Design a binder for these strands. Structure first.
Ligand SMILES: [Mg+2]
Ligand SMILES: [Mg+2]
Ligand SMILES: [Mg+2]
Ligand SMILES: [Mg+2]
Ligand SMILES: [Mg+2]
Ligand SMILES: [Mg+2]
Ligand SMILES: [Mg+2]
Ligand SMILES: [Mg+2]
Ligand SMILES: [Mg+2]
Ligand SMILES: [Mg+2]
Ligand SMILES: [Mg+2]
Ligand SMILES: [Mg+2]
Ligand SMILES: [Mg+2]
Ligand SMILES: [Mg+2]
Ligand SMILES: [Mg+2]
Ligand SMILES: [Mg+2]
Ligand SMILES: [Mg+2]
Ligand SMILES: [Mg+2]
Ligand SMILES: [Mg+2]
Ligand SMILES: [Mg+2]
Ligand SMILES: [Mg+2]
Ligand SMILES: [Mg+2]
Ligand SMILES: [Mg+2]
Ligand SMILES: [Mg+2]
Ligand SMILES: [Mg+2]
Ligand SMILES: [Mg+2]
Ligand SMILES: [Mg+2]
Ligand SMILES: [Mg+2]
Ligand SMILES: [Mg+2]
Ligand SMILES: [Mg+2]
Ligand SMILES: [Mg+2]
Ligand SMILES: [Mg+2]
Ligand SMILES: [Mg+2]
Ligand SMILES: [Mg+2]
Ligand SMILES: [Mg+2]
Ligand SMILES: [Mg+2]
Ligand SMILES: [Mg+2]
Ligand SMILES: [Mg+2]
Ligand SMILES: [Mg+2]
Ligand SMILES: [Mg+2]
Ligand SMILES: [Mg+2]
Ligand SMILES: [Mg+2]
Ligand SMILES: [Mg+2]
Ligand SMILES: [Mg+2]
Ligand SMILES: [Mg+2]
Ligand SMILES: [Mg+2]
Ligand SMILES: [Mg+2]
Ligand SMILES: [Mg+2]
Ligand SMILES: [Mg+2]
Ligand SMILES: [Mg+2]
Ligand SMILES: [Mg+2]
Ligand SMILES: [Mg+2]
Ligand SMILES: [Mg+2]
Ligand SMILES: [Mg+2]
Ligand SMILES: [Mg+2]
Ligand SMILES: [Mg+2]
Ligand SMILES: [Mg+2]
Ligand SMILES: [Mg+2]
Ligand SMILES: [Mg+2]
Ligand SMILES: [Mg+2]
Ligand SMILES: [Mg+2]
Ligand SMILES: [Mg+2]
Ligand SMILES: [Mg+2]
Ligand SMILES: [Mg+2]
Ligand SMILES: [Mg+2]
Ligand SMILES: [Mg+2]
Ligand SMILES: [Mg+2]
Ligand SMILES: [Mg+2]
Ligand SMILES: [Mg+2]
Ligand SMILES: [Mg+2]
Ligand SMILES: [Mg+2]
Ligand SMILES: [Mg+2]
Ligand SMILES: [Mg+2]
Ligand SMILES: [Mg+2]
Ligand SMILES: [Mg+2]
Ligand SMILES: [Mg+2]
Ligand SMILES: [Mg+2]
Ligand SMILES: [Mg+2]
Ligand SMILES: [Mg+2]
Ligand SMILES: [Mg+2]
Ligand SMILES: [Mg+2]
Ligand SMILES: [Mg+2]
Ligand SMILES: [Mg+2]
Ligand SMILES: [Mg+2]
Ligand SMILES: [Mg+2]
Ligand SMILES: [Mg+2]
Ligand SMILES: [Mg+2]
Ligand SMILES: [Mg+2]
Ligand SMILES: [Mg+2]
Ligand SMILES: [Mg+2]
Ligand SMILES: [Mg+2]
Ligand SMILES: [Mg+2]
Ligand SMILES: [Mg+2]
Ligand SMILES: [Mg+2]
Ligand SMILES: [Mg+2]
Ligand SMILES: [Mg+2]
Ligand SMILES: [Mg+2]
Ligand SMILES: [Mg+2]
Ligand SMILES: [Mg+2]
Ligand SMILES: [Mg+2]
Ligand SMILES: [Mg+2]
Ligand SMILES: [Mg+2]
Ligand SMILES: [Mg+2]
Ligand SMILES: [Mg+2]
Ligand SMILES: [Mg+2]
Ligand SMILES: [Mg+2]
Ligand SMILES: [Mg+2]
Ligand SMILES: [Mg+2]
Ligand SMILES: [Mg+2]
Ligand SMILES: [Mg+2]
Ligand SMILES: [Mg+2]
Ligand SMILES: [Mg+2]
Ligand SMILES: [Mg+2]
Ligand SMILES: [Mg+2]
Ligand SMILES: [Mg+2]
Lengths: 271, 46
RNA sequence: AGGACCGAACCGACUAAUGUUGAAAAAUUAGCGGAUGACUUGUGGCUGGGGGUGAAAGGCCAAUCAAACCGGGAGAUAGCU
RNA sequence: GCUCGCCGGAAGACCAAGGGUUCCUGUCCAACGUUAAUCGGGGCAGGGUGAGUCGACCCCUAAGGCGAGGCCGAAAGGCGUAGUCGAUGGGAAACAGGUUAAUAUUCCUGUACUUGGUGUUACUGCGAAGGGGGGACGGAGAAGGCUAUGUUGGCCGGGCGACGGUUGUCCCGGUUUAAGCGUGUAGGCUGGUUUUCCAGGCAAAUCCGGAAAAUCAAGGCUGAGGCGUGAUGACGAGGCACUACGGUGCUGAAGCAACAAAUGCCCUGCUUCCAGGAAAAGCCUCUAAGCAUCAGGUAACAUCAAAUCGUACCCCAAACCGACACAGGUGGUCAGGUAGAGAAUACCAAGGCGCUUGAGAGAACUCGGGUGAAGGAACUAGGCAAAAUGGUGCCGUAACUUCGGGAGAAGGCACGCUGAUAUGUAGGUGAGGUCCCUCGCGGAUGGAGCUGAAAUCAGUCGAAGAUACCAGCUGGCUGCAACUGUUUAUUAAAAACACAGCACUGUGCAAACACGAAAGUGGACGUAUACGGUGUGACGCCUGCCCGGUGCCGGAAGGUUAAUU
RNA sequence: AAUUCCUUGUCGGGUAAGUUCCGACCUGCACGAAUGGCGUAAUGAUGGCCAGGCUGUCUCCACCCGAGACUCAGUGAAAUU
RNA sequence: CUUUAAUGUUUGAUGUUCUAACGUUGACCCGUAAUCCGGGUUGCGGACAGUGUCUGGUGGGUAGUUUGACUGGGGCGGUCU
């Protein structure tokens, strides 16, 4: 539900916020939290490695079950919560033996639902099965790459993967970039799409609204001096150069992937 | 008009103190240069 | 509710006069801008010189910066005074 | 010593950092003090810092530092596991009065509290490097209840006034009391109790979690303040006796009530919003290994111990950072009266000061101010400077607009004092008395006393009633940038940078990219609705032709083409 | 025209008089569509122009109040040569 | 000798399969109280990836340097036997 704010201030004029009234209002679950600290883009040598990072609100880390590992024990969803560490929501589930866990929230999941994992689960959203047991053509999320490693594909909000073809011990998938990839059929995947599909309709509205997310200003390369950026210099607005990165590499059109170990799993690229 | 020297004993000892000179290889040669010269006071620690 | 309105503390520095062997190696006096936020502040910590950091002025890095300070090559070289 | 002036949200008082004898007493005036000096933060000598409860030390951790093994590296060395350090954060306990020339929550007087050790007695299962709970946490807003504190009245002691009046509805002063202990209040949160079972908490559990019944409905936790006690005490106006004119000792009256009231407390509460808001120990509980007449655990009483280091003084500054006894800089705390919306501003209280050269004179000229005939920007690069407006309540208000604004648009009227409505109004707060009660810090009813705006009518004084300090100048056309913001510490604050928004492009995760001879790390405990690079810069209407040149992307039939043989 | 040399182009408005300003013409030395084109309410210690009030800015200066300058006592520099 | 097929040697290249070198930032057990490291069981890749020597291309990312003289001042123009 996207609601436009009335222009009672210059900074409130263009803001569009996504509000979900079913999210939990109180505090999160205590035993499943941790501590993470900001880095500021600095690595163990102290230097800046990633630019335009630093500041923002304080956050905690929520332990989410990316493996969906325990089988044969049904669970019932209790509440949908807001996770500051990702763009999707999460759901707190209560297992039949009395154990609680955090999972990604599929689209159309509400409190009181039933979820199940393993090889003898039903084909309903929020169920985890190996891809041998999933019909060809199904739409799945939280896809694995190596059996037992945990989910790594289609974890953002509104994304999904498409099962295109099964060939022996390998299944072919269509990723959100429109890329075909082969994955061992022993890997697991959760049925359905990821929730929060309205995430992309939001508009921040003002400069300060991006500083609450730890994003610092970006200075254009052409606004610097020649010593700083290969784009710098000029009496007025002079460019006369082929655009490049701050370190001197073509920034438009030049492919940068050089990986030969895992080219045999790519069927065709995004293009 | 704030000046450049703002005293603090804790940060003076943590930077130029004796136990900080002897932790690194190049800091121990500072002491050997001041022992050879003949300094009455080696480090700042007083 | 508000990177909302007027205005003290607090943070700045647009105009004018004085000062210029100054009270002060950047201030004083009268007005001035922001003032619940991209705010301001205490303590501790991290990034080291062809390097750091930079809402980008070649700015800042101990009154020193189109390449800091100290010691060394070193009594560099000087068709010039 | 008597007067005068100045500060009083500080130019008063207290902490922290930093300094180190500047602190107090005796003594001296050579050098130091922008002058003299009998004076001093100056010279010489002596004296002064007293802790179970304040701080450090100590137990525990954040960012981060080191790091047995270990991985890497010409050597030096780099990163890091188990560990071990590291506050700016978490963990037990004391308050009132008196005293010294100089210390006191440390000494003395009165009344308290905490944590361990040992001994006696009585009951009993204890036990961790392990499980669970708790510690434990955001921004903003609003109301209720209180307190600090203040004003007035009552009470007590004193006065009857240098010049008209002052035995009264007159004047001055005082009216103070803590931690601790009992009570569990305004209020906040929460359903209790008993049986059976379980794929969970790495094994176990009676603990936490989950499931199924039966029974009762009030049980429990937290909590400002008030009251009683502490306290037949201490303190206290004042009087009295000496004095070595500094001060010593004795006695000591009253010590109540109403109203107003915080930015402080209940409140780590309540409501709400998105940007979703530390860790570990102290503490509670549960069992495993082991012991089981033992060791242990709980309780009452007795008794012992709490070591070591700091403690003087500077109080936003003559002692700290500025070479100076320098119109500079320095984190936190306290917060009286009248006027006021106010921590602004004016005058004062407690308190502290008059800024370490003076005495005359009353020229030009310079600096900071006051007033000005007629004119009113004619000055000038330019209304630079100066002059001018300035508060509250009500009436009224254009083009344009992204429908919020423009707008405090523009402009206008009223404003003092006295009397009445009303011997003080609407309102606020509230003691008796009556009734009820599960009896209490209770419920209803009741209204003495206290406080009290705003308005209307009438009269009245001045040249002037927002009378001082304080406190917008307004309007019309146009370039640039959408807006708040950032920038050349010290001649440039802007049209320059950023910005939300848009587009291209790279990246399938051991991701692209960056710091690194490498190991590793950031990106990210993220996964294409995500991340990096480049350009443009809200929004509205739009973004046309050119691939010859340079660059980039895709293809490999043919020519040339390295090491190699 | 933040762009236009010739150029104070030409026409209109405003002034007694307007190289600046507002509105148009097109002859664009040498505008032009994300090194974005044309508009745009609100915002600005932003550049230009015109009005009302107000005045010592000015015609053209005059007087007054304090701090120096001047004389007396104490201390007592500097650039330069 | 040309055009040619055949038995047979030299192997150059093109795929397919295999596991034992090699990789694993998949799962599990131990050192061990430990998300590093090492050893073992297993799955998945597999003579590919990657690294050392030699070598063709690209390479202002970085470094060292050059860029003449005469001249009615220097540049522009002209000149240098
Ligand atoms: Mg580190
Ligand atoms: Mg951007
Ligand atoms: Mg620049
Ligand atoms: Mg360059
Ligand atoms: Mg240009
Ligand atoms: Mg060009
Ligand atoms: Mg504001
Ligand atoms: Mg403003
Ligand atoms: Mg303001
Ligand atoms: Mg003002
Ligand atoms: Mg300036
Ligand atoms: Mg100025
Ligand atoms: Mg101000
Ligand atoms: Mg000022
Ligand atoms: Mg600091
Ligand atoms: Mg650099
Ligand atoms: Mg940088
Ligand atoms: Mg420049
Ligand atoms: Mg250099
Ligand atoms: Mg030398
Ligand atoms: Mg020399
Ligand atoms: Mg030499
Ligand atoms: Mg005064
Ligand atoms: Mg004041
Ligand atoms: Mg000290
Ligand atoms: Mg001394
Ligand atoms: Mg003395
Ligand atoms: Mg003398
Ligand atoms: Mg003297
Ligand atoms: Mg002395
Ligand atoms: Mg203590
Ligand atoms: Mg310590
Ligand atoms: Mg650590
Ligand atoms: Mg290390
Ligand atoms: Mg080692
Ligand atoms: Mg420790
Ligand atoms: Mg501390
Ligand atoms: Mg504590
Ligand atoms: Mg005591
Ligand atoms: Mg004495
Ligand atoms: Mg004292
Ligand atoms: Mg005491
Ligand atoms: Mg005592
Ligand atoms: Mg005593
Ligand atoms: Mg625990
Ligand atoms: Mg805390
Ligand atoms: Mg809250
Ligand atoms: Mg009271
Ligand atoms: Mg009289
Ligand atoms: Mg008389
Ligand atoms: Mg009285
Ligand atoms: Mg009394
Ligand atoms: Mg209650
Ligand atoms: Mg514990
Ligand atoms: Mg003291
Ligand atoms: Mg002090
Ligand atoms: Mg003071
Ligand atoms: Mg002085
Ligand atoms: Mg001073
Ligand atoms: Mg006051
Ligand atoms: Mg006022
Ligand atoms: Mg005079
Ligand atoms: Mg004058
Ligand atoms: Mg006049
Ligand atoms: Mg007159
Ligand atoms: Mg007149
Ligand atoms: Mg006039
Ligand atoms: Mg004129
Ligand atoms: Mg003129
Ligand atoms: Mg002015
Ligand atoms: Mg004025
Ligand atoms: Mg307007
Ligand atoms: Mg103003
Ligand atoms: Mg113009
Ligand atoms: Mg702007
Ligand atoms: Mg600045
Ligand atoms: Mg400047
Ligand atoms: Mg879009
Ligand atoms: Mg893309
Ligand atoms: Mg731009
Ligand atoms: Mg645009
Ligand atoms: Mg185009
Ligand atoms: Mg082309
Ligand atoms: Mg072509
Ligand atoms: Mg090509
Ligand atoms: Mg011109
Ligand atoms: Mg005309
Ligand atoms: Mg004119
Ligand atoms: Mg005319
Ligand atoms: Mg004019
Ligand atoms: Mg004309
Ligand atoms: Mg003019
Ligand atoms: Mg025009
Ligand atoms: Mg035109
Ligand atoms: Mg053209
Ligand atoms: Mg242009
Ligand atoms: Mg373009
Ligand atoms: Mg533009
Ligand atoms: Mg335009
Ligand atoms: Mg405007
Ligand atoms: Mg601004
Ligand atoms: Mg203007
Ligand atoms: Mg006009
Ligand atoms: Mg005028
Ligand atoms: Mg006038
Ligand atoms: Mg004149
Ligand atoms: Mg003077
Ligand atoms: Mg001399
Ligand atoms: Mg294989
Ligand atoms: Mg290979
Ligand atoms: Mg190879
Ligand atoms: Mg170069
Ligand atoms: Mg050389
Ligand atoms: Mg020459
Ligand atoms: Mg010549």
């Amino acid at each position: 539900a996207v609601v436009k704010c009335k222009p009672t201030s210059p900074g409130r004029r263009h803001v569009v916020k996504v509000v979900n009234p079913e999210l939990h209002k109180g505090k999160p679950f205590a035993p499943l939290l941790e501590k993470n600290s900001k880095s500021g883009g600095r690595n163990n040598n102290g230097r800046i490695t990633t630019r335009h990072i630093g500041g923002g609100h304080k956050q905690a880390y929520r332990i989410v079950d990316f493996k969906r590992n325990k089988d044969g024990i049904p669970a019932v969803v209790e509440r949908l919560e807001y996770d500051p560490n990702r763009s999707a929501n999460i759901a707190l589930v209560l297992y039949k033996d009395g154990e609680r866990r955090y999972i990604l929230a599929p689209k159309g999941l509400k409190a009181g639902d039933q979820i199940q994992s393993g090889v003898d689960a039903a084909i309903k959203p929020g169920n985890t099965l190996p891809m041998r047991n999933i019909p060809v053509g199904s739409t799945v999320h939280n896809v694995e790459m190596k059996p037992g490693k945990g989910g790594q594909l289609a974890r953002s909000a509104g994304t999904y993967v498409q099962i295109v073809a099964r060939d022996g011990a390998y299944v072919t998938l269509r990723l959100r970039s429109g890329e075909m990839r082969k994955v061992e059929a022993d890997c697991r995947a959760t049925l359905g799409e990821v929730g929060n599909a309205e995430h992309m309709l939001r508009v921040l509205g003002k400069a300060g609204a991006a500083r609450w997310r730890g994003v610092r200003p970006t200075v254009r390369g052409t606004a610097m001096n020649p010593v700083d950026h290969p784009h710098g210099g000029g009496e007025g607005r002079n460019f006369g150069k082929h655009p490049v990165t701050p370190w001197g590499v073509q920034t438009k059109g030049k492919k940068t992937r050089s990986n030969k170990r895992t080219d045999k799993f790519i069927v065709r690229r995004r293009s | 008009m704030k000046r450049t020297f703002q005293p603090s004993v804790l940060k003076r000892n943590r930077s130029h103190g004796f136990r900080a000179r002897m932790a690194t290889k190049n800091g121990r040669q500072v002491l050997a240069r001041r022992r050879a010269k003949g300094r009455a006071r080696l480090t700042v620690s007083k």
